[PDB]
Amino acid sequence: APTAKLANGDTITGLNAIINEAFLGIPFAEPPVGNLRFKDPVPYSGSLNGQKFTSYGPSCMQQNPEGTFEENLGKTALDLVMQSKVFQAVLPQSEDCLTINVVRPPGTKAGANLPVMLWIFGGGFEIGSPTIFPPAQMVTKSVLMGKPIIHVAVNYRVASWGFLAGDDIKAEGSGNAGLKDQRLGMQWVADNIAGFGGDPSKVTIFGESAGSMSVLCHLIWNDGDNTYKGKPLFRAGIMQSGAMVPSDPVDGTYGNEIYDLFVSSAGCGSASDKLACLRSASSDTLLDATNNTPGFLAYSSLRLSYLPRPDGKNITDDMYKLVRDGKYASVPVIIGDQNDEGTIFGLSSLNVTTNAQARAYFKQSFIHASDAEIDTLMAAYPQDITQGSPFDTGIFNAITPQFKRISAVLGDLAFIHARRYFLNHFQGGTKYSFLSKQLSGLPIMGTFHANDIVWQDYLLGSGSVIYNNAFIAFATDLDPNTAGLLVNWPKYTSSSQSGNNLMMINALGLYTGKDNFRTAGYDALMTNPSSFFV
Amino acid sequence: APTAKLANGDTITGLNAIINEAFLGIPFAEPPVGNLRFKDPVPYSGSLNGQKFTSYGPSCMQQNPEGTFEENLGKTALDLVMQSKVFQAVLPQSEDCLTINVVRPPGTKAGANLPVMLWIFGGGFEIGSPTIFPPAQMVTKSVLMGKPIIHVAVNYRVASWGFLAGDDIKAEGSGNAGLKDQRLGMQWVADNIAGFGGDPSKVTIFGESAGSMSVLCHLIWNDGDNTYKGKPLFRAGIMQSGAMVPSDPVDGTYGNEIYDLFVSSAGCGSASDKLACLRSASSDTLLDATNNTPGFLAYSSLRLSYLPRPDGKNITDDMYKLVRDGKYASVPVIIGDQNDEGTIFGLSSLNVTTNAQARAYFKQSFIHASDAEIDTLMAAYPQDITQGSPFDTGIFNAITPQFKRISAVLGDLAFIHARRYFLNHFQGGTKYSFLSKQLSGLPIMGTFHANDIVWQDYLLGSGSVIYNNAFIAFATDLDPNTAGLLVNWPKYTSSSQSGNNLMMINALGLYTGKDNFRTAGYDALMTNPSSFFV
């Protein structure tokens, strides 16, 4: 069977899956249970010598995406699904979840020095795990290209377990636990991947949605010092939908509001030492308490209950400011979007149908925005159903008179104009950007959020030449054009540059275009980004 | 353990589920495999003495709802789900599927002489089984009411296995195999239910969607002679969404068109004896061939590949004409609808966006309708998005300019105006009718097809007082009003009667109204119903 020697000299065994060799479920941290809840992960101390790693371990605990303090049929439906024996059997969860997964080409030996693609899964900072992002399609393609890579997927804590915030968390130094899980995994790769056939000096970190925003967070982490034992932890990044998190600090308003609701819901409202009270609760009590706070499909939508926040320590400030001010690691990057990122999320506010109600939803969601800033937003993103998302669909997809508008705002603030802001300010390396229109015409959803996961991990489609081939080429050669694409991918310098600067995808293939759309919306959101933070 | 003696003297054992006693998986026919495929069911000949019946048997073989001779991602997506080990373990399927299920109140003994509610599941005549229609809610409520009932659910063949048609089937006398399965199960109840505590002379047949249409078929079966050994097989019927099947005979155009496609797809196109060739094929071959014919969610939509059809033998003619001409059993009935029956089915034609395209879709679907009849239809069901389904939603739900229109037509022809035709012509017994608006405001779907299953079998909602209490009272006393409803349920005489004749449901409970809506569409469809047959 496949084997590998770890840094400490432990020899572990993996799975010959014929199409790849997999070392799955390797612990990299002590179980963050009991009194270690919410805290920085502790490096794994024991020996793994002679053990077998041939199946994925459990996910970290998962929040109901329709969780909320309200009662409703959607919360109930997903709860029944996620609690079923059937679900629990296929996708088990546990607080003892800090595992890492290494999947390499067949026959790869220690010393192969292959480039490493280190995947950070996305799930709203509230669900997901490595288990549901199969690496085989990427690994197999890499071999076919003559550019073999090793895929590494790190598990990290989500929801309350990973992103609890508020004053107590800040004062203890425990902000952004799940990002610290990711970071420790990156360090694990630095120290251990060589014995699997990987080159620790050729790690590309990549992720989608919350995983893409995590990649950004890794760029600005420790004001962009990405060094470990004197060497950079990664040499490139790929961001599939998401850059800066538009978030207030850990000890800000909504981090404390969620913390107070979580504490109360967990039965710890009378405690003088609330974090100790939480650490003492049963796992079920914390799960129920988490599901009593909004999940990312609830009405609150992308005003997330759990997400990375500046903590004044490892994320030292407003992430837009960090990028503006140069506080990032210097690496080349790819960053891109799906055309209609916001549509799934717009399905969460379908009781908002009038202009006045849309205004009230925006004001509830954007607690820092002035009436004048909301006016500017609502001028830039008008009710006119032809101008919203799914873009370029005219009078189609009008579920309500506001759905396409709300979708457009959501998609641009959370992902598409966030990307443009990043690209206009980031000078740390060569930049490439894409915009997919692969599913134009798909009713209601359009080219929706995370469809790229399908084409990257599950099926072959026109976009697979980007999500697999170009990304492998980038990870290998720091240039996606060594993939031999049928269209040259131009470098991105700014949204004002004279020529085409986006790699575009449609159902029939590749072409190029410009990042010069919805400029009024960009100006409304990005003149003062912190006015639209959550 | 619970036990029951069958008519042949065999004693069988069931399950004490505490909230009911269940005898699950009882064979009532010989396995319709091999040379018995598509044929009438053969009564089961073996002994069951001493056997245990404590879990559901497999479903009959299921067609992919997105099946088609075309390739597309939806068809693919559902195939991979239905083929997964996880699905196959929870919901197994087999051609050896002719089982019946008896679920009775706790402590019920032989001799209890309880009313029987005989459930006929729905699934488009293409999917479904008794397994996913849990009887516990009904049975528990009946005890609570002091009107205990026994719930019996019969399995029957669906899709090609149950409703293959065309010239060869007609000539053999093998039409409507799955209705024959149901009928044999009714005979089984007549002969055997007394041993379980049931009164065979107090059977009410009930079903939803294809099961509701099946109830109508049982009313007109053998020109309305519903006896077995000289005794009626049932004394009442309840139709949850669906009455007459608007279908041409077994040997008409589309029955032959589907047969030819099935034969060809099964590798039997060169056969002189096509039925013998099909009967010789492997199970997987017939499954793949079936999935190469449209399923009810494919573009063809409710122009079903598989459905009951007049056969000149047991369904002797056009079922609208049978009802007009009085060729039905004289029993009282309940029949009703969900307000927005058509919306799920309108999701299957979202590439239909212009009036010309709508016209073409209607003409493809209704091969017998003249251009004048299509003109009349498209005047009665205008493009005007405010007039379509979800009804009473104004400019909302406009996925396309035709979605609400197509949904309205589908809903009215297949279910809502079909019910009104039935009610206006049926004089076999007292009639009661309901219309649910329980989910008014639900985006896109409205009060959608089959939502009543939720409130009947899974959750308590305002409609449960009809789908459980009133139906129990009707099966007990042939009058839903013995349930002590908060609103008296008026008898239905005709759609022109002077007073309110519909029991209505909304989220907050019961009220009454009139069956006098969309009269232009009734006239367009029902002046000559056979012009709109499939």
Ligand SMILES: *[C@@H]1O[C@H](CO)[C@@H](O[C@@H]2O[C@H](CO)[C@@H](O)[C@H](O)[C@H]2NC(C)=O)[C@H](O)[C@H]1NC(C)=O
């Ligand atoms: C988060 O930031 C803190 C504070 O800068 C880091 O803590 C420092 O760690 C270095 C090691 O390079 C020590 O020499 C310093 O004394 C520490 N400073 C303080 C104020 O404690 C910490 O390592 C960072 N955590 C991660 C996971 O990067």
Ligand SMILES: *[C@@H]1O[C@H](CO)[C@@H](O[C@@H]2O[C@H](CO)[C@@H](O)[C@H](O)[C@H]2NC(C)=O)[C@H](O)[C@H]1NC(C)=O
């Ligand atoms: C749309 O529905 C949401 C979710 O129910 C409504 O917001 C809730 O409204 C109730 C009633 O005021 C409050 O108790 C909850 O705290 C609200 N939840 C959240 C997360 O805000 C919302 O008011 C509805 N919007 C419109 C325009 O009707």
Ligand SMILES: *[C@@H]1O[C@H](CO)[C@@H](O[C@@H]2O[C@H](CO)[C@@H](O)[C@H](O)[C@H]2NC(C)=O)[C@H](O)[C@H]1NC(C)=O
């Ligand atoms: C379907 O209709 C046929 C035609 O009436 C029924 O066939 C009769 O069956 C009886 C008893 O089984 C025979 O004695 C007659 O000879 C048959 N008549 C003819 C002309 O075929 C058949 O029973 C009906 N099937 C069901 C299940 O009701």
Ligand SMILES: *[C@@H]1O[C@H](CO)[C@@H](O[C@@H]2O[C@H](CO)[C@@H](O)[C@H](O)[C@H]2NC(C)=O)[C@H](O)[C@H]1NC(C)=O
């Ligand atoms: C909507 O899509 C359907 C399904 O693909 C189209 O119907 C198919 O059209 C192809 C191309 O002509 C034919 O080869 C298939 O036989 C058709 N299938 C069926 C079941 O009819 C349909 O034409 C499209 N409608 C519009 C308005 O574009």
Ligand SMILES: CCCCCCCCCCCCCCCCCCCCCCC(=O)O
């Ligand atoms: C109009 C309402 C405005 C709501 C506030 C928006 C501004 C705050 C945005 C905060 C960042 C949220 C997004 C973080 C990425 C996760 C989105 C959930 C993705 C779920 C799919 C998971 C996946 O497959 O990756």
Ligand SMILES: CCCCCCCCCCCCCCCCCCCCCCC(=O)O
């Ligand atoms: C505009 C397109 C017109 C299409 C032709 C319509 C006329 C033919 C109607 C034929 C009868 C179809 C209906 C039979 C009932 C089944 C409908 C599928 C239900 C799937 C849900 C199953 C369930 O849970 O019950």
